[PDB]
Design an enzyme around this catalytic site. Structure first.
Site, PDB file in Angstrom:
ATOM      1  N   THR B 125      13.504   6.240  14.230  1.00  0.00           N
ATOM      2  CA  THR B 125      14.227   7.403  13.740  1.00  0.00           C
ATOM      3  C   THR B 125      14.521   8.399  14.850  1.00  0.00           C
ATOM      4  O   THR B 125      13.644   8.728  15.646  1.00  0.00           O
ATOM      5  CB  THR B 125      13.444   8.086  12.638  1.00  0.00           C
ATOM      6  OG1 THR B 125      13.260   7.165  11.567  1.00  0.00           O
ATOM      7  CG2 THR B 125      14.236   9.243  12.117  1.00  0.00           C
ATOM      8  N   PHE B 155       9.654  11.840  14.363  1.00  0.00           N
ATOM      9  CA  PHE B 155       8.871  11.353  13.232  1.00  0.00           C
ATOM     10  C   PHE B 155       8.214  10.007  13.520  1.00  0.00           C
ATOM     11  O   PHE B 155       8.305   9.082  12.726  1.00  0.00           O
ATOM     12  CB  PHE B 155       9.727  11.246  11.975  1.00  0.00           C
ATOM     13  CG  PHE B 155      10.392  12.521  11.559  1.00  0.00           C
ATOM     14  CD1 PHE B 155       9.675  13.669  11.391  1.00  0.00           C
ATOM     15  CD2 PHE B 155      11.733  12.536  11.258  1.00  0.00           C
ATOM     16  CE1 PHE B 155      10.290  14.812  10.993  1.00  0.00           C
ATOM     17  CE2 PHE B 155      12.349  13.676  10.852  1.00  0.00           C
ATOM     18  CZ  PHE B 155      11.628  14.816  10.719  1.00  0.00           C
ATOM     19  N   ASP B 239      11.793  -4.821   5.405  1.00  0.00           N
ATOM     20  CA  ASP B 239      11.574  -5.302   4.046  1.00  0.00           C
ATOM     21  C   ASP B 239      10.091  -5.364   3.707  1.00  0.00           C
ATOM     22  O   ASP B 239       9.651  -4.808   2.694  1.00  0.00           O
ATOM     23  CB  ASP B 239      12.227  -6.663   3.847  1.00  0.00           C
ATOM     24  CG  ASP B 239      13.712  -6.566   3.646  1.00  0.00           C
ATOM     25  OD1 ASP B 239      14.173  -5.531   3.141  1.00  0.00           O
ATOM     26  OD2 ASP B 239      14.423  -7.537   3.952  1.00  0.00           O
ATOM     27  N   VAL B 240       9.293  -6.003   4.556  1.00  0.00           N
ATOM     28  CA  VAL B 240       7.865  -6.017   4.289  1.00  0.00           C
ATOM     29  C   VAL B 240       7.260  -4.630   4.406  1.00  0.00           C
ATOM     30  O   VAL B 240       6.317  -4.297   3.678  1.00  0.00           O
ATOM     31  CB  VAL B 240       7.164  -7.016   5.213  1.00  0.00           C
ATOM     32  CG1 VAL B 240       7.294  -6.581   6.633  1.00  0.00           C
ATOM     33  CG2 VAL B 240       5.720  -7.136   4.847  1.00  0.00           C
ATOM     34  N   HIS B 337      -5.051  17.985 -15.691  1.00  0.00           N
ATOM     35  CA  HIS B 337      -6.195  18.740 -15.183  1.00  0.00           C
ATOM     36  C   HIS B 337      -6.055  20.218 -15.475  1.00  0.00           C
ATOM     37  O   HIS B 337      -7.047  20.940 -15.481  1.00  0.00           O
ATOM     38  CB  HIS B 337      -6.405  18.551 -13.680  1.00  0.00           C
ATOM     39  CG  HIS B 337      -7.155  17.315 -13.322  1.00  0.00           C
ATOM     40  ND1 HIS B 337      -6.545  16.101 -13.125  1.00  0.00           N
ATOM     41  CD2 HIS B 337      -8.476  17.100 -13.169  1.00  0.00           C
ATOM     42  CE1 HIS B 337      -7.459  15.197 -12.836  1.00  0.00           C
ATOM     43  NE2 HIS B 337      -8.639  15.777 -12.858  1.00  0.00           N
ATOM     44  N   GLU B 362      10.626   5.489   5.088  1.00  0.00           N
ATOM     45  CA  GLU B 362      10.967   4.073   4.978  1.00  0.00           C
ATOM     46  C   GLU B 362      12.321   3.849   4.317  1.00  0.00           C
ATOM     47  O   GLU B 362      12.540   2.824   3.683  1.00  0.00           O
ATOM     48  CB  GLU B 362       9.899   3.294   4.222  1.00  0.00           C
ATOM     49  CG  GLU B 362       9.722   1.882   4.675  1.00  0.00           C
ATOM     50  CD  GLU B 362       8.615   1.726   5.661  1.00  0.00           C
ATOM     51  OE1 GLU B 362       8.200   0.577   5.892  1.00  0.00           O
ATOM     52  OE2 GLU B 362       8.137   2.749   6.176  1.00  0.00           O
ATOM     53  N   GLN B 366      17.854   7.210  -1.940  1.00  0.00           N
ATOM     54  CA  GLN B 366      19.292   7.019  -1.872  1.00  0.00           C
ATOM     55  C   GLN B 366      19.642   5.763  -1.089  1.00  0.00           C
ATOM     56  O   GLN B 366      20.487   4.981  -1.522  1.00  0.00           O
ATOM     57  CB  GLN B 366      19.955   8.239  -1.265  1.00  0.00           C
ATOM     58  CG  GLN B 366      20.086   9.405  -2.199  1.00  0.00           C
ATOM     59  CD  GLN B 366      18.776   9.959  -2.624  1.00  0.00           C
ATOM     60  OE1 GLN B 366      17.845  10.029  -1.846  1.00  0.00           O
ATOM     61  NE2 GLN B 366      18.690  10.365  -3.869  1.00  0.00           N
TER      62      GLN B 366
END
Ligand SMILES: Cc1cc2nc3c(=O)[nH]c(=O)nc-3n(C[C@H](O)[C@H](O)[C@H](O)COP(=O)(O)OP(=O)(O)OC[C@H]3O[C@@H](n4cnc5c(N)ncnc54)[C@H](O)[C@@H]3O)c2cc1C
Ligand SMILES: Cc1cc2nc3c(=O)[nH]c(=O)nc-3n(C[C@H](O)[C@H](O)[C@H](O)COP(=O)(O)OP(=O)(O)OC[C@H]3O[C@@H](n4cnc5c(N)ncnc54)[C@H](O)[C@@H]3O)c2cc1C
Ligand SMILES: Cc1cc2nc3c(=O)[nH]c(=O)nc-3n(C[C@H](O)[C@H](O)[C@H](O)COP(=O)(O)OP(=O)(O)OC[C@H]3O[C@@H](n4cnc5c(N)ncnc54)[C@H](O)[C@@H]3O)c2cc1C
Ligand code: SF4
Ligand code: SF4
Lengths: 389, 379, 262
Positions: B125, B155, B239-240, B337, B362, B366
């Protein structure tokens, strides 16, 4: 006929032997038609028998025997209880209350154990029994079986007896029960109804031994109570041999230690004295520390004290604190918010001590006492030692 | 779905472990001091949680994807940051090594992080490139004996704790998405510098900063697979990884629910207990059914991966739905609570804060919807 | 060396506390765990393996095929070979029969130098089986083990006593029952589980171990359970009264003793 005397078939028999009444496979009063010795002999020796068991009686001699724990040659208080309701045991079926003692040079305990209620007492003053040993008394008490075969043999659930008992049972091929709670005798069939708690204390069971003589059971410390002491009835001090061997006791002791365990976690404890804002001063925990010491457990706290500075968070109990399932809990000067009651609801028994009767804690208090704990707490310790803990 | 008897055992392990080693006392100290105890990380690698799906052929553990999801769930339930320290070598660091890495690179790079000696950051990123990772701006130039890079990555999880970092730079600036290569960079090298640790809302215990690259030279022998493959490398790792994020969604979810029904059983207000008021009990139901419905969503995705069919849609659904209904759940648990669920001592507030990135990082929800709808509408 | 450990699968007594106010608490499906003290014993043997290399550990048990799974756990911890004893006759037996068939199941393996068990199992609470296996096999027995250290041919150990402990020397071979105070058993490994499920388990029977077909389990059982009932709840949370500060304490402490461990 042609038993070649191969000696390979000695230990698979379930009572380990039958061998040396001058000879191996010179068997007799313990063949149980098991079927281990069918083919294990190289030439198929004894081959027709087996559907017969041993039920051949004359199996009813007397004997109500109490073992005496003799820590450093002193009767351990556990025996006064075992002699308390064990004398009751002997009386209902009808028999003398015999006792066995094994020590080094025990002389005065003879008269003590005679006085506390026992009819007959057996003694083994061999300085070889100065310390505790599992084979010494194993072989020494096994010796008292072939000669003075009793019907009932009791033991203490103390760390000594709970080791002696299973070892003694396997050799005599009888039945045993674990730390028991209460016992009796079925009046017409002469046998003993042994009761104890199992499954962590959730399923009680009355286990009985019908084809087993004698009947033995380790009994828990504190369930019975003391018998009458110093009628100074009689005594029939009987002798056994103490015939030790040339390394017939493989357990040998280097050191014995007596520790003072003071560190104990509120989660591991079995008895808890918890204190809340009903102390006013941080010094209250001394009182509860006095209380916890006669019982052998730790002091816990509620949030009010922690956020006041009277204790540390390690001690706190509730949803934010830590959950406890002791055998006893002391709810001392705690309002009783669910924020606390949540973390001890399953304490086996909850005892409350609060000033105001309108405190919720009395909802789950098994026993409640209204008042100022600074007066109630010390009085509780008074009657505590007055019976003997 | 249906669990293989070995996977049930692994579930048992991760349960007793995560429950036993992540105590209240510790987790509180992690929030106060944003530092996860290295001793626990070592403890995890020693029993292999750092190597779940990597096979024994390469010195891994020989588990399946379902074992990675199981451990992800059961850990994340107890602590979010633990999960973060868990997914990195399993999925985000050990992914591209496992795919586009020569045998030498895997010997010198992967086994260290499985045993917990080295730490590896997955850095994609940029400040200008978020959802649109294809619009990168970090450059990578071929000088012959080494590669030269000039860019900046925001990040980057765990980066100040990491020894090397897989960094994606643009090689062919004209090809864009077709012209991105992947390199392994020793973070200790020249030019490389780190930004400040970012103060995030939750998931406190793991540092997160910028990786600044200023004329940093990288040898050619440290490039990931073929040139201009980097992008497909990162997708197929993603994907994983997304399966991972949905996995922790489902973990902390099941947890906050467990705390939910616990408090609702114990608290009394009108003489009845909380849980015997119809609004609450129904609310518990609603949360439970979504959670299960979707547990079944993600379990299914991972099983597809294990049987080698493409799971690119199924995983995207798993990340999307799992994280979203996780947030809904976390909130509702606060509301059960009541007031107390707003104080930090009640675990539910740490969850509520943790579970929020789940729909962002990740790939946002969107981006997830873009992948899924774009997959269903092609004609 | 060969170290045999006797591990038992048992119902988790911690959780099964509650029952309906109209119910004998035998539940539907209760979780079966490795008896804690057995976990301690197995750990001790795993540390001897950790310290003395090339020492193989044989774990054995007797019960149903369901116990197989617990054995797998043992293997995932690091055990070497697993052995199970199951038969129609074995079930429903007392400590004498259980110990007999256990030691008999021991006799048919590679002769062991050390045998480990637990103090007691949370389902029977008897603390007898181990010592009966020991002396039934004419060996030494040392229970309540708190610290175990073997000195290359013979064993010196701690014995947890109510007020302390006894350091004791014993000649190998021998059996010594373990207690949870002595060690923190290690976890399984993700690799330990996968490698555990592939190692095969050898399962014997009453006609396989060269034993009594006729008199095992319930057949040769000296002790036999007869009554099986629940203990009563007290319920009444009625207070203690009195005139005097001490007068209340007496009734409290006295009731607290009668039908109590005090
Ligand atoms: C987020 C949060 C979490 C919390 N978590 C917990 C938790 O885990 N555990 C917890 O316990 N609390 C917790 N609390 C606080 C809890 O709600 C109560 O504030 C706390 O229990 C009050 O302390 P106490 O229980 O000792 O009762 P208090 O009200 O503080 O004690 C007063 C009581 O003692 C009596 N009393 C006073 N003097 C005497 C005396 N001399 N002798 C005898 N009785 C006397 C009074 O009559 C009254 O019954 C939490 C609060 C919050 C906000
Ligand atoms: C920052 C803050 C400041 C505050 N300031 C003040 C203040 O100045 N003064 C003051 O007096 N209080 C104050 N409070 C307390 C707050 O107003 C109350 O706690 C609030 O009314 C909720 O109380 P509770 O958590 O105990 O409710 P609980 O009863 O403990 O919560 C029960 C939960 O279940 C639900 N519920 C309750 N009863 C039922 C029912 N019968 N059927 C169905 N659902 C039910 C409720 O919605 C709630 O979610 C403050 C609280 C906070 C967090
Ligand atoms: C409620 C109840 C009451 C009972 N009461 C009695 C009684 O009074 N007398 C009696 O003789 N029997 C009794 N039994 C039967 C007895 O429990 C059985 O022999 C049982 O199989 C052994 O459990 P235990 O409690 O004796 O084990 P324990 O003696 O507590 O176990 C000690 C050690 O034995 C080892 N061990 C035992 N069995 C196995 C096994 N199959 N595989 C591996 N290791 C093993 C374990 O390592 C354990 O640490 C009772 C059973 C029940 C359910
Ligand atoms: S088995 Fe046959 S041979 Fe071996 S001792 Fe017994 S009788 Fe003699
Ligand atoms: S069968 Fe009778 S004789 Fe043969 S071993 Fe068993 S008991 Fe001894």
């Amino acid at each position: 006929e042609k038993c070649i005397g191969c000696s390979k078939c000695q230990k698979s028999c379930p009572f380990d032997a039958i061998t040396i009444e001058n000879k191996i496979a010179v068997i007799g009063d313990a063949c149980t038609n098991c079927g281990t010795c069918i083919d294990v002999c190289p030439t198929e020796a004894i081959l027709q028998e087996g559907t017969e068991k041993i039920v051949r009686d004359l199996s009813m001699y007397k004997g109500v025997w109490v073992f005496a724990e003799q820590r450093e040659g002193k009767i351990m208080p556990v025996v006064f209880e075992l002699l308390g309701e064990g004398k009751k045991l002997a009386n209902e079926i009808g028999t003398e209350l015999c006792a066995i003692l094994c020590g080094s040079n025990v002389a005065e305990l003879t008269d003590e154990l005679f006085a506390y209620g026992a009819d007959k007492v057996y003694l083994a003053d061999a300085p070889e029994l100065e310390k505790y040993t599992t084979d010494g008394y194993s072989k020494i008490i096994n010796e008292a079986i072939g000669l003075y075969k009793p019907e009932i043999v009791l033991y203490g659930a103390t760390h000594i007896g709970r080791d002696l008992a299973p070892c003694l049972a396997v050799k005599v091929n009888t039945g045993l029960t674990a730390d028991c709670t209460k016992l009796e005798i079925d009046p017409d069939d002469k046998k003993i109804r042994q009761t104890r708690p199992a499954f962590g204390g959730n399923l009680m069971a009355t286990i009985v031994c019908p084809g087993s003589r004698p009947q033995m059971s380790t009994v828990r410390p504190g369930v019975m109570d003391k018998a009458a002491y110093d009628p100074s009835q009689k005594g029939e001090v009987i002798k056994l041999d103490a015939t030790f061997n040339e390394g017939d006791i493989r357990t040998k002791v280097l050191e014995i230690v007596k520790t003072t365990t003071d560190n104990i976690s509120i989660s591991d404890a079995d008895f808890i004295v918890s204190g809340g804002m009903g102390l006013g001063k941080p010094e209250g925990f001394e009182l509860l520390k006095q209380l916890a010491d006669k019982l052998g457990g730790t002091v816990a706290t509620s949030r009010a004290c922690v956020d006041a500075g009277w204790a540390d968070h390690a001690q706190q109990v509730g949803q934010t604190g830590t959950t406890v399932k002791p055998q006893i809990y002391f709810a001392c000067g705690i309002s009783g918010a669910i924020q606390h009651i949540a973390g001890m609801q399953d304490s086996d028994i909850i005892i409350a001590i609060n000033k105001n009767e309108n405190a919720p804690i009395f909802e789950v208090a098994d026993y409640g006492i209204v008042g100022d704990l600074y007066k109630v707490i010390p009085a509780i310790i008074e009657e505590l030692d007055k019976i003997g803990k | 779905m249906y669990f293989s008897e070995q996977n049930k055992m692994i579930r048992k392990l991760a349960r007793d472990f995560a429950e036993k080693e992540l105590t209240t006392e510790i987790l509180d100290e992690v929030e106060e001091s944003g530092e996860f105890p290295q001793e626990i990380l070592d403890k995890m690698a020693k029993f292999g949680f750092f190597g779940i799906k990597i096979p024994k052929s390469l010195g891994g553990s020989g588990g399946d994807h379902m074992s990675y999801v199981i451990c992800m769930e059961e850990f994340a339930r107890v602590s979010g940051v633990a999960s973060v320290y868990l997914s990195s070598p399993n999925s985000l660091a050990g992914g591209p090594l496992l795919l586009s890495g020569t045998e030498e690179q895997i010997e010198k790079y992967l086994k260290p992080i499985i045993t917990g000696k080295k730490k590896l950051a997955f850095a994609l990123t940029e400040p200008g490139a978020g959802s649109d990772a294809g619009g990168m701006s970090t450059t990578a130039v071929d000088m012959g004996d080494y590669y030269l890079l000039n860019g900046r990555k925001t990040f980057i999880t765990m980066a100040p704790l990491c020894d090397d970092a897989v960094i994606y730079a643009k090689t062919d600036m004209s090809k864009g998405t077709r012209g991105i290569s992947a390199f392994i960079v020793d973070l200790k090298s020249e030019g490389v510098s780190m930004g400040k640790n970012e103060h995030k809302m939750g998931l406190i215990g793991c540092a997160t900063s910028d990786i600044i690259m200023e004329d940093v030279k990288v040898p050619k022998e440290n490039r990931l697979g073929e040139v201009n493959k980097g992008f497909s490398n990162a997708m197929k790792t993603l994907d994983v990884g997304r399966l991972g994020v949905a996995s922790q969604s489902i973990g902390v979810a099941q947890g906050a629910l467990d705390e939910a029904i616990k408090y609702a059983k114990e608290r009394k207000q009108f003489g009845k207990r909380i849980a015997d008021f119809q609004a609450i009990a129904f609310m518990i139901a609603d949360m439970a059914t979504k959670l299960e419905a979707a547990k079944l969503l993600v379990y299914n995705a991972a099983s597809l991966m294990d049987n080698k069919k493409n799971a690119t849609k199924e995983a995207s659904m798993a990340k999307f739905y799992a994280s979203e209904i996780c947030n809904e759940i976390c909130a509702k648990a606060v509301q059960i609570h009541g007031g107390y669920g707003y104080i930090k001592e009640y675990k539910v507030e740490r969850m509520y804060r943790d579970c929020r990135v789940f729909t962002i990082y990740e790939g946002t929800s969107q981006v997830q919807q873009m992948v899924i709808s774009g997959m269903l509408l092609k004609k | 060396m060969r170290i045999l450990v006797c591990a038992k699968q048992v119902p988790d007594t911690n959780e099964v506390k509650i029952d309906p106010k109209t119910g004998t608490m035998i539940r539907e499906g209760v979780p079966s765990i490795l008896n804690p003290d057995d976990a301690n014993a197995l750990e001790a043997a795993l540390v001897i393996k950790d310290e003395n290399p090339g020492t193989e550990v044989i774990v054995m048990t007797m019960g149903p095929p369901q116990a197989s799974e617990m054995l797998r756990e043992c293997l995932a911890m690091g055990a070497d070979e697993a052995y199970l004893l199951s038969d129609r006759a074995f079930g429903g037996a007392d400590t004498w029969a259980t110990s007999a068939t256990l030691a008999a199941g021991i006799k048919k393996v590679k002769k062991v130098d050390l045998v480990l068990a637990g103090r007691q199992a949370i389902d029977g609470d008897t603390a007898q089986v181990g010592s009966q296996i020991a002396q039934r096999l004419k060996m030494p027995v040392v229970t309540y083990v708190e610290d175990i250290k073997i000195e290359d041919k013979k064993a010196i150990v701690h014995r947890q006593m109510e007020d302390g402990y006894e350091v004791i020397e014993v000649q190998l071979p021998c059996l010594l029952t373990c207690v949870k105070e002595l060690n923190d058993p290690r976890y399984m490994s993700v690799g330990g589980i996968m490698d555990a499920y592939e190692q095969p388990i050898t399962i014997w029977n009453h006609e396989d171990i060269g034993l009594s077909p006729e008199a095992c389990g319930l057949n040769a059982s000296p002790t036999q359970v007869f009554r099986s009932f629940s203990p009563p709840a007290k319920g009444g949370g009625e207070m203690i009264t009195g005139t005097t500060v001490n007068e209340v304490a007496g009734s409290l402490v006295s009731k607290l003793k009668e039908k109590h461990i005090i």
